[model samples]
Target: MKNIRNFSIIAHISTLSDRIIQICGGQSVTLDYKASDGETYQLNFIDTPGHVDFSYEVSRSLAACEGALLVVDAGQGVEAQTLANCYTAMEMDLEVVPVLNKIDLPAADPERVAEEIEDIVGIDATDAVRCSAKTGVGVQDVLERLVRDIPPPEGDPEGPLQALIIDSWFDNYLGVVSLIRIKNGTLRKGDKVKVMSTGQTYNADRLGIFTPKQVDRTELKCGEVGWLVCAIKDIHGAPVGDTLTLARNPAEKALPGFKKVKPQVYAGLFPVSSDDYEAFRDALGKLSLNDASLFYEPESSSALGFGFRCGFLGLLHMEIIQERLEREYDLDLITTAPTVVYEVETTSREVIYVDSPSKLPAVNNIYELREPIAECHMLLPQAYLGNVITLCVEKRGVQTNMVYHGNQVALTYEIPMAEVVLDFFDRLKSTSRGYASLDYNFKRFQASDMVRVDVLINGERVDALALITHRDNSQNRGRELVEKMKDLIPRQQFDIAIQAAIGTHIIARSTVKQLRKNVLAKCYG
Candidate 1:
């Protein structure tokens, strides 16, 4: 049917994914894919997470869609991840319906954004729609363009079943539930299905449409979106991107798309008290079940005692996880300074990956070592271009190229992942006056003469903030981190001394101001 369409909504971090869903009248309502819409056509909307740290998840969601609703903030124009996602969508040959959102803002210059789209994507401004998703103005035109531009899914309904798992999460009562996009054939409740990649099979115990609240069992036909629940005991068995098919004629192979995510930043996590180790582990397990971007391994430290080495998507992701653990899980956790993966080459011609400073081979055992580099893209207005460029160069970032879209520019550079992992983002925002957005992906590992840098608090090794970085920027980076922590960490009764050093070489030191008194004592009286 010409009116039928399936697409995913994508934008940069903090971008609105809900606005597009509401404009389509598909807010929290699930239409049975099998039910004929009659004259009122249907739109299947998939709201995608926007943070670049969740790229792997976004890739999986995009693969399952036939088209994409690309939303850019009118005032902000195009961002780094916006271009990346646009390239990805083009690579998949999906129809792109671009919309310039946030037109309600006074700073929003729709004319400028439309021209940028034309210059970058070669799409005429007249052809694209400018809208304010918040005010619902121009939203109707955006929806109409979806039906006219995006293609509806088409497949042989009689052929073997092939469905892509777009989203999956755990529920204490439901076990592992998956939202799937059926490409061909039909699937119904009580059918035995196999998850092709894991060689795991389970009968579809319940198949239903998600209507804000779960209701009504339904059969999912070709080109349909629906939810299926399996009594899957193992969450690992039904990973996102896994295919579901009839057991007799399962999908020949898993769907082809992006690679699985490998965490680039790692930190040590431990309970404040040793007694909370089990609870901390349980909290992490539950958190991981909800988000697969994180990885952990059991570890023990003489200083921090029993804990785990946690891998994260990025610095922001790590911070968000720590905050959520403290707020939602109600667990006090001590986190080590985040580190980037290193490539170690030994004299014996052996190469290995080292993620922890303690695991780094001794000088005698090492031939050469290097740190991973990241390809970074920063998009910002012309006013802040000079300052952004200066900051990048100061941090040892090599400028690669620059492209202009109207008055806005997209700056590309090659920088060590370790350099940008810390406060580079904050610096960028401050220097650009909060007009810039940045995104990066791991490029490759390159040889770097680096050494382990340790941060100490109160003359004791923190262990959680230990890092490995190039000798050139070690001191500066360390001092910046310590200063940030001084502002971040709450003051205590005793003053805390934060020191950054390499071996016996002291590079930088800072102290947290001590708390003079407690108001709690007066309240008790």
Candidate 2:
């Protein structure tokens, strides 16, 4: 089976998807192109989502691959995500093809990078491939090494139809479409298939393999990857990582390694106008179908009225979702600031984690409240190391350890999740002159005097915009957020007053500088 090769490209967030594609010697075209590699030669390159917010997508992508191309930026060396990706690849037992990308850059030093990889990951450097996606240098050798390293799929074709779902989303016209990798048996058009987890059966009306351009109708065989279109009504019913088996010879057991993602951040999302509620809900649902990690539910407020209480992987994920919704779905939405969930313990020994401000118990109603903590790792040039350290301490982070990587320093800190979820990265980047890269993972819950910081615009409480933070920094953080919001949030027709409060005590306040011009009135009414 020299013809079959399934692998995923894993890298840091700044590593572009197109770079991964080109390094694999695959042509970079628009979102569509047919598979030109021929039937005898199959290359299923699973592109893992690089952003931390899309970790679920990354996990699902890894499950579908036989191995991974662990790409590290040569100049930057091993960042937080590089180690995380390597760990994930190891956990999956996928052969790691360690690639040092960006070798063509003037700052690149492949020899040092090789040494770092060997020290950090305990991998042999002689076999590591160094390449540049921009210059097309050493890319061919990387692809050749991938072909030699990754193993081929081995399964009985006559066995029951078993396939792993990589991704599923609802298309306005197609209803529910799923991207799957068939491990055993074959699936053809009109074949009856059942999702073993949900006990939902559907007749495969169309079976096809994904080419760069379009989904071409074909009978996908064992050891092949393809797209399946069935009469499945709900996207949630056919979740990613679920296994599909033929109706006649159904799967005896579900495929392992499916874990429910817990959202660490919550916010309220509301349409700018009441008339757009239906469109807002529908758009959110469609977005959720594509990204299962983004959890959304209905909530209401006296000020904002009816809206969605959405759970996000992190702050970046929240921003990206909002941007996507506005750009792709054409929906105008108002989002509240993000807040981390807090575990509250009562004198009665009852324990509950509060996610929304409206659900928060009164100060006297609780014995203790704790906020989640995260272990943060940042790699930055030596010059900005002091600034980063100072900023971290200000955010309630304690320095744990510091190590040097070439001229850069890798600093580890135990910080409250609340601190990093804000503009921490942005501030760090500015201070470091764009030389710092940050990575963090959830550590544990810690006891803290967290005060509920409520944000109000125009004297009305924005329920979705509440945050829980150390009482000391609540007011300053709230004021800073308001200032940033003024710049981020577009100008509106009505006057807006941004205020941050702690239990009826106003801590910080700012007003969106009034809008001087209104072209809408001149154009429409």
Clashing residue pairs in candidate 1 are: 336-464, 337-464, 337-465
Tens digit of per-residue lDDT, candidate 2, span 234-340 = 77778878899998888687768766668988888888788889988888877876676789999886657788999999878888899988999888887776777
Mark the 10 consecutive residues where model 1 has the least summed lDDT: 27-36
lDDT at position 35, candidate 1: 24
The C-alpha local distance difference test score for the whole of candidate 1 amounts to: 0.76
Give candidate 2's total backbone clashes: 5
Off by over 4 Å in 1: 1-3, 11-40, 72-76, 100-109, 130-138, 271-279, 454-465, 475-525
Angstrom error of the Cα, residue 373, model 1: value is 1.1
Q: Candidate 2 local accuracy as lDDT?
A: 0.76
* Model 1: how far residue 472 lies from native, Å: 1.7
lDDT of each: 0.76, 0.76
Instruction: Quote the lDDT for 185 in model 2.
Output: 79
Candidate 1 local lDDT, 436-459, one digit each (tens):
888888888888888887777778
